[PDB]
Design an enzyme around this catalytic site. Structure first.
Site, mmCIF file in Angstrom:
data_model
loop_
_atom_site.group_PDB
_atom_site.id
_atom_site.type_symbol
_atom_site.label_atom_id
_atom_site.label_comp_id
_atom_site.label_asym_id
_atom_site.label_seq_id
_atom_site.Cartn_x
_atom_site.Cartn_y
_atom_site.Cartn_z
ATOM 1 N N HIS A 41 0.813 -1.211 0.000
ATOM 2 C CA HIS A 41 0.000 0.000 0.000
ATOM 3 C C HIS A 41 0.851 1.268 0.000
ATOM 4 O O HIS A 41 0.299 2.363 -0.145
ATOM 5 C CB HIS A 41 -0.997 -0.029 1.176
ATOM 6 C CG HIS A 41 -0.459 0.490 2.473
ATOM 7 N ND1 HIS A 41 -0.061 -0.341 3.501
ATOM 8 C CD2 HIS A 41 -0.325 1.754 2.942
ATOM 9 C CE1 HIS A 41 0.347 0.391 4.525
ATOM 10 N NE2 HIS A 41 0.187 1.665 4.214
ATOM 11 N N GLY A 143 2.846 5.274 10.654
ATOM 12 C CA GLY A 143 4.185 5.050 10.168
ATOM 13 C C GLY A 143 4.812 3.753 10.620
ATOM 14 O O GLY A 143 5.972 3.494 10.272
ATOM 15 N N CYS A 145 3.887 0.832 9.660
ATOM 16 C CA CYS A 145 3.762 -0.161 8.602
ATOM 17 C C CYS A 145 5.119 -0.683 8.170
ATOM 18 O O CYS A 145 6.092 0.069 8.069
ATOM 19 C CB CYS A 145 3.051 0.440 7.404
ATOM 20 S SG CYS A 145 1.364 0.782 7.762
HETATM 21 C C1 7YY Z 1 -2.686 3.994 14.142
HETATM 22 N N1 7YY Z 1 -1.987 2.941 13.420
HETATM 23 C C2 7YY Z 1 -1.442 1.864 13.944
HETATM 24 N N2 7YY Z 1 -0.901 1.144 12.960
HETATM 25 C C3 7YY Z 1 -1.124 1.798 11.828
HETATM 26 C C4 7YY Z 1 -0.681 1.333 10.455
HETATM 27 N N3 7YY Z 1 -0.936 2.328 9.417
HETATM 28 C C5 7YY Z 1 0.132 3.244 9.016
HETATM 29 O O1 7YY Z 1 1.204 3.191 9.523
HETATM 30 N N4 7YY Z 1 -0.117 4.206 7.964
HETATM 31 C C6 7YY Z 1 -1.402 4.286 7.311
HETATM 32 N N5 7YY Z 1 -1.619 5.286 6.256
HETATM 33 C C7 7YY Z 1 -0.542 6.190 5.831
HETATM 34 C C8 7YY Z 1 -0.718 7.560 5.689
HETATM 35 C C9 7YY Z 1 0.361 8.369 5.261
HETATM 36 C C10 7YY Z 1 0.469 9.733 5.046
HETATM 37 N N6 7YY Z 1 1.716 9.994 4.641
HETATM 38 C C11 7YY Z 1 2.367 11.246 4.280
HETATM 39 N N7 7YY Z 1 2.415 8.792 4.594
HETATM 40 C C12 7YY Z 1 1.570 7.810 4.975
HETATM 41 C C13 7YY Z 1 1.746 6.422 5.112
HETATM 42 C C14 7YY Z 1 0.691 5.630 5.522
HETATM 43 CL CL1 7YY Z 1 1.473 4.025 5.503
HETATM 44 N N8 7YY Z 1 -2.468 3.381 7.707
HETATM 45 C C15 7YY Z 1 -3.774 3.467 7.057
HETATM 46 C C16 7YY Z 1 -3.988 2.284 6.103
HETATM 47 C C17 7YY Z 1 -2.950 1.437 5.755
HETATM 48 C C18 7YY Z 1 -3.202 0.386 4.886
HETATM 49 F F1 7YY Z 1 -2.208 -0.471 4.526
HETATM 50 C C19 7YY Z 1 -4.467 0.182 4.369
HETATM 51 F F2 7YY Z 1 -4.683 -0.857 3.514
HETATM 52 C C20 7YY Z 1 -5.503 1.029 4.716
HETATM 53 C C21 7YY Z 1 -5.252 2.080 5.586
HETATM 54 F F3 7YY Z 1 -6.245 2.931 5.945
HETATM 55 C C22 7YY Z 1 -2.246 2.402 8.760
HETATM 56 O O2 7YY Z 1 -3.127 1.674 9.072
HETATM 57 N N9 7YY Z 1 -1.788 2.897 12.088
#
Ligand code: 7YY
Ligand code: 7YY
EC number: 3.4.19.12
Lengths: 302, 306
Positions: A41, A143, A145
């Site tokens: 993703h 972050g 992920c």
């Molecule tokens: C609270 N929490 C606990 N674990 C997680 C995992 N997680 C994450 O780390 N990041 C996500 N969205 C991003 C937005 C970004 C904005 N910028 C500038 N860069 C970004 C990078 C990410 Cl990776 N998400 C949301 C999400 C991630 C997915 F892989 C998915 F399939 C659906 C989702 F809604 C997230 O869950 N967050």
């Protein structure tokens, strides 16, 4: 003596964590040999999250769209492919810190250590169980992920989890290192909810055996039970049913403690109908279910 | 979201663990620059440990008696000396994995990670709190002596604990990296009992904040109290007194959550008297006192350690 939730030493995995950036998205990657693994993703944009067509978005990509950073050293992506839900980036330098490793898919109830990582810098390590509903009760901030879960066995690192998303209930969903999700989840921002969780009964029994080994003495009883009578009661308390396989797994602990598995099951049964009446078991006043029968043998005496 | 007991990434310390052997005794050593640190009780026999003269035991020993094993490469001891209860072995080679490090001594209620090793081989990592009675509630089996407790600040590893012994009550005792014991103990085979422990109050409030941040809000009341009124109740329930320094430390958690400490103390005050009435906080049925206020801020603000 003593009994702690213990994680594996995280050094072998620390040497593999890198930062993967694609466009504005920045998550963590797992750098093994000349391949960096990370959640696919990372190639999504704000719009491409509800219904992403990952094959279309990836055929879409050039190697120089990806920025990989190991400390202050920018690796060079020389190739990029997808395997299910994990992106695989070929880099021009093999990671000299790569350990002996393998990719293993685990089953509900199995435990592993998770190395929480942000911008490719490890932040902390903790212990997890794969819940019966295929989620994990992690600690993860945005972050995180690409953070991986692992076990270590004779300096071999079995990778069994990579973190992808947080569910509405606050629990987390991920894949194995081949990109197949644990559970009926998809890497999409659509409506997704986990099943009702249940207690890993075989793990609680293991923990109860660990309490006796450490000398705890207050919960056991003169009673025994049939497997079916136990399962009937347990299920009424949101406990996982117990199969003859589980009974076999506990065999060694039963042998070491002189308490048959179905005797201990009768002790779990009573514990579930009375509570613990102010008392604790190994310092916990709830029944712990994140210790497998393997873990119990490894950390406990002999 | 979520909340877990979390340890520092142990990697920097793993590269410092060696196996030290004296006669038949074998335990773990910490290799920093060209010195290896380990408990001095390694030079003890099964009867000298009842009442030794670590002075005379040491001087009688020679360098080739100490088998220092770095994984499998053998290190050559070129000198040995004591500093309180920690033995120091000078080796001919400086540890190329030596991290930016210092020796610190921690206070009761402060937390640290422990890298449990056996025969110099790191086996598991976990997060402890120095108890008020100066013990730690660890999980050690024989062979664990020399296992070290540490904190990581940026790239600096702060070694604060070395394991020495288990008490007959099951809890554990050791020294800082300068050999000074934590608490009223000695490295001898005698009858030693842990003092009566107490609850690290400032760590419970910090944990209640972590619960609020995770949206677990049922225990919040509407009342507020005063340090005096709280501490009067806290003494009865074997709770550590809450000082004025303790309140300021909970400042950022307070402002991030909108729950003023003392208001929080009213919640903890109620929990202390009425119990939790069959409810749980972060899935736990007891009040958790092994999370410091900084621990909570670190875990709920994603600070990494390279
Ligand atoms: C609270 N929490 C606990 N674990 C997680 C995992 N997680 C994450 O780390 N990041 C996500 N969205 C991003 C937005 C970004 C904005 N910028 C500038 N860069 C970004 C990078 C990410 Cl990776 N998400 C949301 C999400 C991630 C997915 F892989 C998915 F399939 C659906 C989702 F809604 C997230 O869950 N967050
Ligand atoms: C179960 N457990 C968990 N922690 C502890 C603490 N502890 C320990 O780990 N080892 C000890 N004696 C040794 C015998 C050895 C035999 N061989 C071959 N190698 C050995 C190494 C050790 Cl380190 N002791 C005993 C002990 C050591 C002391 F320094 C002391 F002051 C009092 C004591 F009772 C021990 O307590 N055990």
């Amino acid at each position: 003596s003593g009994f702690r939730k213990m994680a594996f030493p995280s050094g072998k995995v620390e040497g593999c964590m890198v930062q993967v950036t694609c466009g504005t998205t920045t998550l963590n990657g797992l750098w093994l040999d000349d391949v960096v693994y990370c959640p696919r993703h990372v190639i999504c944009t704000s719009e491409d999250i509800l219904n992403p067509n990952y094959e279309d978005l990836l055929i879409r990509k050039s190697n120089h769209n990806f920025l990989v950073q190991a400390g202050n050293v920018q690796l060079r992506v020389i190739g990029h492919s997808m395997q299910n839900c994990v992106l695989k980036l070929k880099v021009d330098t093999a990671n000299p810190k790569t350990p002996k490793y393998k990719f293993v898919r685990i089953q509900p109830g199995q435990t592993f250590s998770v190395l929480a990582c942000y911008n490719g810098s490890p932040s902390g390590v903790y212990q997890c169980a794969m819940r019966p509903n295929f989620t994990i009760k992690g600690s993860f901030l945005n972050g995180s992920c690409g953070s991986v879960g692992f076990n270590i066995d004779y300096d071999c690192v079995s990778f069994c989890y990579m973190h992808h998303m947080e569910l509405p209930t606050g629990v987390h969903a991920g894949t194995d290192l081949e990109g197949n999700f644990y559970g009926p989840f998809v890497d999409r921002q659509t409506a997704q909810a986990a099943g009702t969780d249940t207690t890993i009964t075989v793990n609680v029994l293991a923990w109860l055996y660990a309490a006796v080994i450490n000398g705890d003495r207050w919960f056991l009883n003169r009673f025994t039970t049939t497997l079916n009578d136990f399962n009937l009661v347990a299920m009424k308390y949101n406990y996982e049913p117990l199969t003859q396989d589980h009974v076999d797994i506990l065999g060694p602990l039963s042998a070491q403690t002189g308490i048959a598995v179905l005797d201990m099951c009768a002790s779990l049964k009573e514990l579930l109908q009375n509570g613990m009446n102010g008392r604790t078991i190994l310092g916990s006043a709830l029944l712990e279910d994140e210790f497998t029968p393997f873990d119990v043998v490894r950390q406990c005496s002999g």
